[PDB]
Design a binder for this molecule. Structure first.
Ligand SMILES: [Co+2]
Ligand SMILES: [Co+2]
Ligand SMILES: [Co+2]
Ligand SMILES: [Co+2]
Ligand SMILES: [Co+2]
Ligand SMILES: [Co+2]
Lengths: 314, 314, 314
């Protein structure tokens, strides 16, 4: 599978520093090397150089809107670039606010994509519903066409154009959703599988129904936005907003292996990895190793084993 | 959902002190506040004042029969009182022996109730089969009509009248059952889902079959007697008789969410929480937080999110 | 169930010392006593006395071939002996290389047996595909008829005769398979349920399909070769090659309970238990206790409870 790696060291979408290091710790663990060994042609586009934003003043309750907005704006352009070069875009970043740029950029080249959002949260608060002002909890609001009129013009996002419909997205792993978010979620009739649905149906059925919903009418590019907090903190503790009772390591690997086999993975986000947020060094390694294993599975790594098309015994 | 909280600080049904504190640690964690914030009208009936029982002498192998018996007798009256006030009875207690009083009291106002017993044990030993004499392991024996003649008249339980049939109870989570208990269990044809059944069927099917069995012929009030040791000690370690390989946090929350949605929850017991039995302070907090999360789910708290009936965006 | 215990204190199939102690730590934990208390007639054949092998020189990359080979050769004879005495053979050992002797010996008396291999690995490397030379990772290669011509004559295994077909074996729990192994696995059309299959289908369906495949046409003796690393290291950490994301304790007990109920268990291997490989004493106890619980379940121990055919209340 042909890949284009983009590093997004940015953390202004949220209050806990350390997420900007996600790209480095992930590369440090050998992500590019590991992909190569696998069935992959990898190209590194480097880490996006996010410059200073002068009057980066809070817009009402919304914090660092200009920084976050500009950051996503640049990412969007970079992703659009890799999608034009015929490669799957692989974004390694800080907070999830960056999904605004990743998906928007991706939608420019492939406007018919479907989104799979693995997270413990919906990240669908609007600048009007958010109680914290942190943009990593509002990305989805800026991308949905349905909310095109329910969202203020926030400084830094003038370039944004809702690129996806509420029917072109599926959530998996929800377990900490705000009342404001739940209202929108239900109201817009968005497809979701909270941990409740995962418990009831099992991850196999969950994946079956997720893919049926998105690709039923016709095949289309798939964008996987993966927030490492979607998994239980026992596997990914080094992250900003961990919530107990999440996806197990196995379910995380099952989700990606499934997506891989569709042959339609077109964009991937590996977000919220914060190397500074571990209670111990081990917690950091565990989290990084899990993030890597998840990425590798998106690109072919199977638990049953792997091999190319030829004779091994000679 | 309208609630009536009753505190049952009693631990004489078993040998490990500290369970009497269950009510306090649970209230301390903010259980009443949390319920209020939720969709609930809560009323506190306080903690039952269990007085001294003079000749509280062991009846054969049976320990503290008079204390345990009197304790349940008082609880029964209190529960009956809250059920008459049109409220769901919420018992926070010490050992599970108290289920004798909770269910008996509940059955007085709603004789057609069905019981769901989440426990790693059957607690169905009789004063004749028990090898320990501890009453927290025999509650079910005193409540079943089928055993009305297979149980001696124990000092302190003269007031007891078997109120439920073997066909009106379902166990979930069994994994440590005595030979004497298994004989009764099988013999009486009682419906059960041991961890074996949970593994085979999955918690979704388990809940489906549990509810179908109990409410198939007709709807009826549901009593959930929850022994925190039903869950794996990795989630509820601060408890007297922990057994490995139990319900996960997710399965525990799935069980309650399901029961909540039936709209028939009429009585609830949250037992065996022992703040003194943790290997570390954290183990105590973990256990208490889990007990609370379980209770909250019984009364509406959903993992997919919550909100009331109105317009949020204004 | 009638049992014949054979101790196999050998570790030359792999590089990490300590596995030879498996038999002792398992007996120390009270395995024989526990089986007796259960529904079992146990007979101890003692620990096979593995003598020194002079020129135990490496055959190419293959290490300790003569030792490993002779060890399995002796085991085979002992197992054949217990199968002739009408008993289920219970092998407690060191590394998995011993499966060569256990299965070969078993096949001599019951040539129609079917094998269930619970492991995180396929242990199917050939002396030609192995990159380490360790025989505990190649047992399956020496037992398969299909590979009768794809395997060199290794010093110490002249006595070996491929006794099982690729269609008479089922793997459960795979998650770390070498490219060379995957090629063979797929090529020979061997039935397997990697953790991927376990995640998708659930352990209940997995067991159903495993047993249907092996006993569909006709009933036949079942041999369970259990590598403790098949389970997740969180339950069996004291083992040589642990891999994350494995079978849970519950799934491990579900697998054995199922096999037990077929009434066809005819041979059992409990391998790779290494008392010296724990990070803490507790990790060693945990691993040993889990190995025991698994064995007990193979012989009748049920989570729902147990009892014999008579009247308990008198
Ligand atoms: Co999140
Ligand atoms: Co997120
Ligand atoms: Co219990
Ligand atoms: Co109990
Ligand atoms: Co192994
Ligand atoms: Co093995």
């Amino acid at each position: 599978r042909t890949i284009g790696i983009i590093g997004a060291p940015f953390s202004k979408g949220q209050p806990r520093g350390g997420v900007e290091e996600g790209p480095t710790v992930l590369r440090k663990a050998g992500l590019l090397e590991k992909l190569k060994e696998q069935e992959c042609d990898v190209k590194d586009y480097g880490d996006l150089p996010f410059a200073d934003i002068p009057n980066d003043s809070p817009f009402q309750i919304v914090k660092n809107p200009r920084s976050v907005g500009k950051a996503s704006e640049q990412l969007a352009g970079k992703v659009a670039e890799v999608k034009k070069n015929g490669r799957i875009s692989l974004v390694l970043g800080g907070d999830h606010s960056l999904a605004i740029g990743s998906i928007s950029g991706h939608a420019r080249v492939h406007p018919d994509l479907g989104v799979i959002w693995v997270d413990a949260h919906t990240d669908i608060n609007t600048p009007l519903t958010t109680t914290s002002g942190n943009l990593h909890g509002q990305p989805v609001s800026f991308l949905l066409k349905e909310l095109k009129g329910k969202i203020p013009d926030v400084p830094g996002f003038s370039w944004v154009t809702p690129c996806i419909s509420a029917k072109d997205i599926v959530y998996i792993g929800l377990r900490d959703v705000d009342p404001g978010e739940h209202y929108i979620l239900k109201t817009l009739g968005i497809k979701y599988f909270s941990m409740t649905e995962v418990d009831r149906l099992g991850i196999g059925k969950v994946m079956e129904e997720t893919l049926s919903y998105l690709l039923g009418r016709k095949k289309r590019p798939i964008h996987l936005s993966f927030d490492v907090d979607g998994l239980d903190p026992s596997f990914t503790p080094a992250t900003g907003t961990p919530v107990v009772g999440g996806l197990t390591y196995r379910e995380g690997l099952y989700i990606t292996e499934e997506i891989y086999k569709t042959g339609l993975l077109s964009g991937l986000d590996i977000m919220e990895v914060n190397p500074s947020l571990g209670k111990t060094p081990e917690e950091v390694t565990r989290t990084v190793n899990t993030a890597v294993a998840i990425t590798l599975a998106c690109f072919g790594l199977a638990r049953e084993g792997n091999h190319k098309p030829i004779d091994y015994l000679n």
